[PDB]
Write a protein that binds this ligand. Structure first.
Ligand SMILES: O=C1CCN1c1cccc(CN2CCN(Cc3ccc(Br)cc3)CC2)c1
Ligand SMILES: O=C1CCN1c1cccc(CN2CCN(Cc3ccc(Br)cc3)CC2)c1
Ligand SMILES: [Cl-]
Ligand SMILES: [Cl-]
Ligand SMILES: [Cl-]
Ligand SMILES: [Cl-]
Ligand SMILES: [Cl-]
Ligand SMILES: [Cl-]
Ligand code: NA
Ligand code: NA
Lengths: 820, 821
């Protein structure tokens, strides 16, 4: 077995090779189905969606016509009709009754009507700019669902509202002064703080009440539930600003693990409008008792909203350890006006009855961790003293499943008149019913756009899941009344990302597999006459057609092996291009390995991981293995590294690498490299530190070197509080074990974005500080204008060029063998 | 000629080699002579001085006895007597002659002792006496009051305080700064030199005691302190990462970048009334009768300041922004009035001051190149009321720094303040009665880095350091200031000397060395023949610090020189490879600084600071160092070569010098030349690779200036002018704007930078990297996370030396480096 050596290209030649092979647009998303209601016309629905028409284009609203019938011999490509004519849209709001779109595009907030009482346009609409007296950028605009004339938005960390008809603009909260410095004033209203956006994927912090309360005057009362945050006690850090000419650093509140999270509470803005759209008064209201007293043990407001009738506000609440979840109904009557006069304040507390109380309709615990998701459906309230809902959970079985729950809304044992504090279980509602809708060794999905859609007429629930395979997401449907058979609606051989129409007669799937790039197709749903419970599907039309299998991309093979740990572990193998018999090639292991991610699945990897194919063309074996802790395999699989991050991941990587090495003689174990970003860069350092016998080179991108520097929401979920896991934090932090790195140079390469807000450069800078003390060699590349991503394409081109060149000169080439 | 390939040591082996070969203390300095006045005793003087006793000991005060006579057959070694006892690191000290009071800071504490005064001379170590305080924070810059040695002054939280060391009274004089408030709002200070003044003009203090006390009718006195008051509110704020990397933070400070605002400055005076028993009566803070901008037209920087010997006038040396105009100005105490926010009382105090009292610009000069500030300025005792007599040094006349005796007429000004108009530029200018050149020639007098003059007013002589015999050696000279002609050299040739003359002018001490021999310190007695007091001879008296001798692990370089095509003789240093094999050519490593205010090539011992150039020679590298045009100690025309043109002329001299050696010596392999330097040296290392990639294979740039707009006002504008008036000078001189010119070959560029550098900020490197990334160019990078323009932690220095040797090995010297292309 002779060693294969890669072609030793120059720096200029590699740049040219990369540029030639480099020669993606956002696929259609955020779908919405509006009915035509026109018996004579040829179309049943109009679908609205966001997309990028090409690579250089901006993301904008489009529409397409869904025909009542189709020529089944042919295939129908729906044409993309532009909705707007502006002189970049991330999301949009819509009001069904009026047909009013509301969206932000650049600095402006705009509105237009389509598909309401005023009909359907046949050409692009010029949008109407919403007026404002506010100087700064307006964020997070939302239509009031009870009245489409009123919008809300955030400006300088305070909630405003504006009327698009009458032009009245009113500030609702006076919590932040923009002029003063952020050290004194660190309060905000209606905005999710850093940890909740970054680690819980909640981006909004205020919620319109869906219904208006009519007054005796002839006007009405609109309500806004919102989060008020106080970040005064949260640690401040200084990250370097993008304007490098201005040699300065921007401040922001980063709650590092162990330290204080923001001080949180619920508030409610009660807005009185008169008979013809004019504001009478705005009453800001607060909880009758403090947040800490009413919600014992709660750190995080994970999710929040309203019930369909607007009777209760709801919220999903977590404790600090993220092992307890509570779903709590909060009545508007629990809020009283904000008064500083102590005599007047005491009367308002007495005016609220003792029967009005927080209602904990669901509670659960786990020894592993609670994974927050977006699934939560509340049914219409039939009985006054009951509430019925669907929720998803891993806590019963260790796999996420849908459960139909009915909770009794008791009057509480605790009485506020006595003047005491409520015990832990005083607000807990008894569970009348708890039926499992789904079950098995597979999970229902509720993240990254995956959710349920409930058909209340047919009494069905649509959902995404891993039932047929952990490598493919599929759409399913099942009854929530007499749950039993789970009917798969998507075709095997692809992994699907689905969106179901609100009318439950259509669904769209964005699908791909290892060989075929992404397609988006529309499918019509229908039942047999004899049984509404049964659901069949039929292909209706293509929205986005694939270009076909790319001629200059060879996809990998998915393999698997039975681990000594007890689990089946899956991997991807890129064989070298033009594989010579009786020769062994250098091997680059690409890794992420952290939680909430799965690299190995049946999806098209030729866009995001296109350069793994490029490595194979140069003559590298490329391997990707999903170790224990990774996503879509249940909570027991995911819980393997609890309190133990860094300690088990590389065992699975080496085990899988040795499985391939014995089964394929062309893998040269003497020249194995490892590379990854974020958690991947972390594990790449751990790989070289723990197993220098296996791994010759390690290229660590944006590595977490020191877990005390990372945030609360993430780190405490998987590693607990630093005091309760002294050893896990030490053993899991590579910066603390600098002496264990090799004394040989050309084995360690550190890559980091200089302006990184998530994984700060200090992780690298402190690692380097200890590497200097330990007398250890290292290589370093900095990307001075990057923030945990590739904003500027030149820095991405330079990264790719350097990595190929580094792997060439220190792993693959003939010179690399001579250099040792 | 075969190429020599250096031995390919591993990383662990080079660490061992450097650890073994690594196996210094401050030599005696800040000397002072005090006479015994004891006829029966054997000693004439006692010398006090600061010195480090050994390798790992603190810097502290010592004394030695100077005997009246010596055995001229023998060589006397003076023993070091410790002045101070061990406490329950002294950088400098004050002394008061009439009382014998020492004052000095040692750690946080300010201490005092007494010796050599009326109370006599100790024969054992004195216990230091702490100056007690109620101030919460570290006290800075303590100074004895020359008028009354009971009083001291110091800075605390950017304000001036005074403390009586006998009565223990303590008082704050200025209320300009608020320690509790943040620096964005409160950017004012008093008695403190700001960043640019400390870093670019070597002024470390911002307040000056008046040396005489005005007596009152009551039987008390008035003490006075002149001080600078700075307002840094409009100055650019920058954030450098704090030493504590645990808290992901950056410390703010005021950095006036080129072309932006310097601090708003003015003179103030604290009038301090003391009663008959040493108690403070009152403190009156006082300000200039008109603003600083009105009285001192065109002035940006207060370069130097102080008082005349009688305390009649305060003086100051003032520069304009371009640094092409110097002004020496006398400022009377009567120009200051008390601070009064009341509008009617303020107007009455202005009217009480006469119109005759006015600023007195006793000297002015200009230049098309630049003003180099120095510490030479000597005011004689005032004989006539309408005259002032003084010695000063300048390059403005001839282009070399020389001493000039000047007499200026103190004219009552034409401008009158009662008219209510602003003065014209020349209204405060004094006429020059006399301007006699004391020295002259194609060589300079030295007035910086400790070099100054000693003026014997009895014999009417002036001692000074200069470059008359050679630009490669510093020497002590003496000459009359009445009838200047003969310049007598006092120090011996073959060494470069650094000298301190006694206040009595009958002794001098010289710290001397040469390329072959380490540093010595020796005492020399001065005397004259009875017939001619002008004629000065010297005689070795005693050794203070004996040399360790030429240690066996260091082979020093040979000083060479070549006649350049530019018309200047350019000097250099050459380290030949150790065990030089015949018929072989070795890889070369050019070490460079090449910026202004520095000379690397001279006849001094280089085996301490540049020990590792010898280590590079031992591994088999040729090491070259060349003082290009712009460097120090060769006159102002030589220095002015790169005005507006930094980065453009320096590498021509480096390559020309390299090619001189290449023709003269066949052992220099021009195919394998490396370049390396720190600061301006790192800047030129980049420029060398950028411009002459044909000559230089590798460049190792340390803390490089990559963008001149990022560097401060005082330095950049002196050499390059204002950015607006020299757009292409700044462009051509900034490597970050010319990133496309770097090589596409990797393993040729290595950047080194201290992450916490406050002088040449890491931003220089990060913005260079920004443009290198855009241009698609390769680079190597090493950061030192806990360093700031120096090596304070030994581990970072050890890592630097290891990586540098290994980099040169793997990408220049070794056999594998040749195959790697
Ligand atoms: O911070 C910063 C600065 C850049 N960056 C950052 C951080 C996290 C993720 C990503 C995006 N991944 C980059 C790596 N990609 C695979 C890949 C393998 C081999 C080769 Br060759 C090229 C690409 C997947 C996407 C970038
Ligand atoms: O910033 C920073 C961080 C370090 N640093 C900095 C900046 C300016 C000056 C100096 C001190 N010089 C360091 C280099 N020395 C010659 C030398 C050549 C080869 C070898 Br190998 C070792 C030493 C002379 C003294 C250090
Ligand atoms: Cl079931
Ligand atoms: Cl129902
Ligand atoms: Cl000694
Ligand atoms: Cl003369
Ligand atoms: Cl005289
Ligand atoms: Cl010019
Ligand atoms: Na996110
Ligand atoms: Na200095």
């Amino acid at each position: 077995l002779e060693p294969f050596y890669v072609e030793r290209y120059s720096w200029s030649q590699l740049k040219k090779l990369l540029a030639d092979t480099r020669k993606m647009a956002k696929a259609p998303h955020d779908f919405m189905f509006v009915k035509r209601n026109d018996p004579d016309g040829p179309h049943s629905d109009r679908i609205y969606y966001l997309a990028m028409s090409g690579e250089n284009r901006e993301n904008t609203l489009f529409y397409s016509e869904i025909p009542k019938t189709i020529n089944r011999a042919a295939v129908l490509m729906l044409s993309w009709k532009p909705l707007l004519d502006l002189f970049g849209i991330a999301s949009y709001d819509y009001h069904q009754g009026s047909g009013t779109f509301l969206f932000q595009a650049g600095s402006g907030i705009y509105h237009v009507k389509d598909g309401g009482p005023q009909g359907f346009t046949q050409q692009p609409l010029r949008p109407n700019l919403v007026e404002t007296s506010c100087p700064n950028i307006r964020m997070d605009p939302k239509l009031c669902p009870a009245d489409p004339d009123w919008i809300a938005f955030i400006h300088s960390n305070d909630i405003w509202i504006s009327n698009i008809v009458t032009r009245e603009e009113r500030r609702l909260t006076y919590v932040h002064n923009e002029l003063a410095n952020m050290e004194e004033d660190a309060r905000s209203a209606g905005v999710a703080t850093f940890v909740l956006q970054e680690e819980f994927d909640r981006y909004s912090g205020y919620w319109w009440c869906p219904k208006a309360e009519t007054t005796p005057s002839g006007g009405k009362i609109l309500r806004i539930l919102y989060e008020e945050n106080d970040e005064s006690e949260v640690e401040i850090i200084h990250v370097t600003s993008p304007m490098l000419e201005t040699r300065r650093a921007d401040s922001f509140r980063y709650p590092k693990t162990g330290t204080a999270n923001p001080k949180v509470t619920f508030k409610m803005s009660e807005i009185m409008i008169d008979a013809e759209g004019r504001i009478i008064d705005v009453i800001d209201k607060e909880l009758i008792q403090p947040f800490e007293i009413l919600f014992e043990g709660v750190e995080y407001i994970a999710r929040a909203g309203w019930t369909p009738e607007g009777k209760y506000a709801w919220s999903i609440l977590l404790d600090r350890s993220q092992t307890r979840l509570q779903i709590v109904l909060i009545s508007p009557e629990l809020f009283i006006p904000v008064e500083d006069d102590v005599m007047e304040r005491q009367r308002l507390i007495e005016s609220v009855p003792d029967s009005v109380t927080p209602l904990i309709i669901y509670e659960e615990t786990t020894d592993i961790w609670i994974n927050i998701h977006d699934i939560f459906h509340v049914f219409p309230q039939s009985h006054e003293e009951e509430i019925e809902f669907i929720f998803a959970s891993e806590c019963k079985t260790g796999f996420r499943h849908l459960y139909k729950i009915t909770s009794i809304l008791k009057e509480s044992k605790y009485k506020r008149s006595s003047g005491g504090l409520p015990a832990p279980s005083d607000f807990k509602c008894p569970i009348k019913e708890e039926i499992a809708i789904t079950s098995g060794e597979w999970e229902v999905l509720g993240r990254h756009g995956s959710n349920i859609q409930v058909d209340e007429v047919r009494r069905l629930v649509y959902f995404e899941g891993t039932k047929d395979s952990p490598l493919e997401h599929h759409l399913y449907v099942v009854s929530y009344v007499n749950p039993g058979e789970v009917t798969r609606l998507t075709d095997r051989g692809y992994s699907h990302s689905c969106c179901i129409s609100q009318h439950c007669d259509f669904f769209i799937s964005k699908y791909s597999n290892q060989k075929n790039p992404h397609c988006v197709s529309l499918y019509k749903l229908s039942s047999p006459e004899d049984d509404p419970t049964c659901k069949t599907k039929e292909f209706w039309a293509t929205i986005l057609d694939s270009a076909g299998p790319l001629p200059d991309y060879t996809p990998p093979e998915i393999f698997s092996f039975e681990s000594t740990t007890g689990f089946t572990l899956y991997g991807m193998l890129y064989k070298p291009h033009d594989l010579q018999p009786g020769k062994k090639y250098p091997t680059v292991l690409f890794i992420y390995g952290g939680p909430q991610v799965q690299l190995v699945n049946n999806r098209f990897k030729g866009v995001k991981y296109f350069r793994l194919n490029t490595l194979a063309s140069l003559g590298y074996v490329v391997v990707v293995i999903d170790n224990r802790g990774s996503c879509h395999r249940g909570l027991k699989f995911e819980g393997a590294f609890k309190y133990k991050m860094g300690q088990i991941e590389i065992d699975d990587q080496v085990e899988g690498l040795q499985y391939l090495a014995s089964r394929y003689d062309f893998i040269d174990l003497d020249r194995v490299g490892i590379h990854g970003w974020s958690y991947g860069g972390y594990l790449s350092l751990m790989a070289l530190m723990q197993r220098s016998d296996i791994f010759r080179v390690a290229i660590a991108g944006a590595p977490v070197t020191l877990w005390i520097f990372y945030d609360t929401g993430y780190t405490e979920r998987y590693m607990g509080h630093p005091d309760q896991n002294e050893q896990g934090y030490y053993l899991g932090s590579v910066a603390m074990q600098a002496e264990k790195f090799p004394s040989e140079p050309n084995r360690l390469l550190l890559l980091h974005g200089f302006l990184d807000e998530n994984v700060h450069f200090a992780h690298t800078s402190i690692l380097l500080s200890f590497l200097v003390r330990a007398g250890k060699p290292y290589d370093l590349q900095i990307y001075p204008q990057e923030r945990h991503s590739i904003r500027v394409p030149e820095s991405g081109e330079h990264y790719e060029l350097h990595l190929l060149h580094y792997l060439q000169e220190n792993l693959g080439s003939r010179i690399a063998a001579l250099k040792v």
